[PDB]
């Protein structure tokens, strides 16, 4: 029914991507979306569906689509499989076990990695608690190391929570950069709002 096209490219070929802990989340509504653009594209290296059809997805309609966007290293590209542990899903981006959506990733050494090092991409390295599903951590406090109190990161046992990614181009693929788009769909007892092309 709905007639206006959903812009994915504002996320997918976005000139600049987010950093991990402050992952970019662009909600989609009142439009239509041809997901064929992705599951035929060769540009993507890793691409997973979770509980959703790759194809009859675009037969389907939703209440809205959430497309998430950020950039991680290589050996943690898999850390956004559901119910997983490691510095990423524990701390700065977590999908729940009961996940329904799509994960897409591809090399960005071509773009996001320059000589010297694109240390401007950071992840979260410390946090007292675990991360909730879709919880966004942009807290910068002292990470109290469990022995002594602290105000300001003065000295030891108080760590600046974050850490840069050294992206040198010569660095290997596990320590290369990887843009990541975490698609996601939801429904509700509320009108259909985002459709696919073949959605009658």
């Amino acid at each position, epitope marked *: 029914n709905i007639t206006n096209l959903c812009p994915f490219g504002e996320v997918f070929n976005a000139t600049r991507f987010a950093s991990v802990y402050a992952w970019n989340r662009k909600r989609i509504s009142n439009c239509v979306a041809d997901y064929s653009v992705l599951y035929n594209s060769a540009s993507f290296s890793t691409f997973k569906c979770y509980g959703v059809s790759p194809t009859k997805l675009n037969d389907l309609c939703f209440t809205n689509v959430y497309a998430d966007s950020f950039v991680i290293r290589g050996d943690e590209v898999r850390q956004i499989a559901p119910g997983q*542990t490691g510095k990423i899903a524990d701390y700065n981006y977590k999908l729940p076990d009961d996940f329904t959506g799509c994960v897409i990733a591809w090399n960005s050494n071509n773009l996001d990695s320059k000589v010297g090092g694109n240390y401007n991409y950071l992840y979260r390295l410390f946090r007292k608690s675990n991360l909730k599903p879709f919880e966004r951590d942009i807290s910068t406090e002292i990470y109290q*190391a*469990g*022995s002594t109190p602290c105000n300001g990161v*003065e*000295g*030891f*046992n108080c*760590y600046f929570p974050l*850490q*840069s990614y*050294g992206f040198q181009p010569t660095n290997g693929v596990g320590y290369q950069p990887y843009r990541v788009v975490v698609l996601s769909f939801e429904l509700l007892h509320a009108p259909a709002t985002v459709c696919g092309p073949g959605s009658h």
Partner: antibody
Amino acid sequence: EVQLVESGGGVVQPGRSLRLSCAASGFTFSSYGMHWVRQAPGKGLEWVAVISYDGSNKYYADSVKGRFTISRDNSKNTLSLQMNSLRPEDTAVYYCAKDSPYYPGYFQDWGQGSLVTVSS
Amino acid sequence: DIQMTQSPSSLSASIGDRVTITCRASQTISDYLNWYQQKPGKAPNLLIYAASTLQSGVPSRFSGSGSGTDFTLTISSLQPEDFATYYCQQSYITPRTFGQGTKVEIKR
């Protein structure tokens, strides 16, 4: 070539004092801060104390909080641990240690060692 | 203050063995752990950081794992050039105390 030699290793009667002098070379002494680590003769390694990148912050071990003190000279590129009311427990060889980056410790660069023997 | 309990106490293994040393933690110290191989009489020589990455120049038969209070030291094939006392240390907290230390033997 990160060279770290040290001296002051010798003799002292308990309750009397001495200090060790770790001389740096082949690396930016300012790059990051140092630790002293103490090895009893043929025993485990015992961490002693740390001093910072900018000579401002120091942690010590609870054995040495009260009678030991750590310091460094960023100009002549040397570290020094002064040890005041020594106990025979303190008999050991000592090592100065670089805090190699580790993005958080991991001492890769050690001094040869120098022995404090506390016999009168 | 945290102590590292590293076991076994000693080890009289032989050539080619795949023997393993372990390290228990007083708290959750997630990866900031280090192993050092002390060729005796000399100063400790580094082995591992993150408990799971080499340092170049160190031979590959070594490794470890663990993400918590319990970690491993994997040595696949022993040569007489592994004869040392192997130590444990947590980089996570300061003081960076150590383990008791574990010695290794050889000889079929």
